[PDB]
Design a protein around this ligand. Structure first.
Ligand SMILES: COc1ccc(/C=C(\CC(=O)O)c2nc3ccccc3s2)cc1
Ligand SMILES: COc1ccc(/C=C(\CC(=O)O)c2nc3ccccc3s2)cc1
Ligand SMILES: [Zn+2]
Ligand SMILES: [Zn+2]
Lengths: 183, 185
């Protein structure tokens, strides 16, 4: 192949040609969790449960290695099994869970903070919550003192916001029905 | 409050006391997406579709700003609407989607790579796929040339693996039914 001018995006045809159908060995795979490290689980738990309305579905403590895992999800607390074995199997088979990792001590270290991936070095950008109404969700967020990266009507793309959690991780607030207009 | 010995993390009742019930204004909120930046969408699309079995449910191009968004999910392709507007609304209301961001040109810069958050500076660690059988999933991964951070029987916690995607992002491979046994161990 001879050298080509700067490509640009992939075309739809190009992207589609890079995609294979799902092998039957993957048919039961599910995207179960996204893991973020948190400095202070008290502030993180208050933010994800009170501000965003998630439920704590599982807490795991590792006394020797000195860390805790918190699993948050949009689940009715009435569906949490009472028996601890059944609870962990149910929690870790939920789609779309958020795993917070607390390395014991980070809440007592004034020089410690995690990196949100949205400045050098970049990688992870954000989690995103679909909401029925971005403007009313963001008005409530304002009233609860939530720090904003992008208010819904600031920047080029109207109807879409970014807030941050107590560690500074970016959270997109989007309305699926308004994303078509943004194209 | 008097000074305390080094914190042993939260007790169950401490953690529970930091949790509020869900305000009715949040009742229809859902955890829709996790966004990772990818150097090369050809490699990333091949990895997430062929190796992990995800479906590309939406591609978005921004020709002036020069980036593309790829939405991947575990969805039956027969459920993807045919009409573009319905398709985007359906795609972006799916739970548990992966959004890959391609900043045009990164695939042509030999000194460029993204950071996976698992060395300084740390933050994000991983996504995780629940599978029926970690050992058979990982045997297949080996045969497809997938790079491993943790083989299922290496390290202290057996029955759990970590692979990496073409950018070096960590992906946990777990069996929900085997995570209970890991607590007692
Ligand atoms: C930090 O400021 C912004 C403002 C807008 C965006 C645009 C986004 C979010 C993203 O890149 O993840 C858009 N997402 C979609 C999804 C579908 C269709 C259009 C858009 S624009 C991103 C960052
Ligand atoms: C990179 O090596 C490892 C090895 C084991 C682990 C343990 C994990 C994964 C994680 O921290 O997310 C465990 N997760 C759970 C979840 C529920 C119950 C037990 C465990 S051990 C993590 C990284
Ligand atoms: Zn996004
Ligand atoms: Zn994990």
């Amino acid at each position: 192949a001879e050298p080509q001018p700067p490509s640009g995006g992939l075309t739809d045809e190009a992207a589609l040609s890079c995609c294979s159908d799902a092998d039957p060995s993957t048919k039961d795979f599910l995207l179960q969790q996204t893991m973020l490290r948190v400095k202070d689980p008290k502030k993180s738990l208050d933010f994800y449960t009170r501000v965003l309305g998630m439920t704590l579905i599982q807490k795991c403590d590792f006394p020797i290695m000195k860390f805790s895992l918190y699993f948050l999800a949009y689940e009715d607390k009435n569906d949490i099994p009472k028996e601890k074995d059944e609870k962990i199997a149910w929690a870790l088979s939920r789609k779309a869970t958020l795993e917070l990792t607390h390395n014991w001590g980070t809440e007592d270290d004034e020089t410690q903070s995690y990196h949100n991936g949205n400045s050098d070095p970049r990688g992870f950008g954000h989690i995103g919550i679909a909401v029925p109404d971005v403007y009313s969700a963001c008005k409530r967020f304002e009233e609860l003192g939530v720090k904003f990266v992008k208010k819904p009507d600031d920047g080029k793309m109207k109807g879409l916001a970014f807030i941050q959690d107590p560690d500074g991780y970016w959270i997109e607030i989007l309305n699926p029905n308004k994303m078509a207009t943004l194209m």
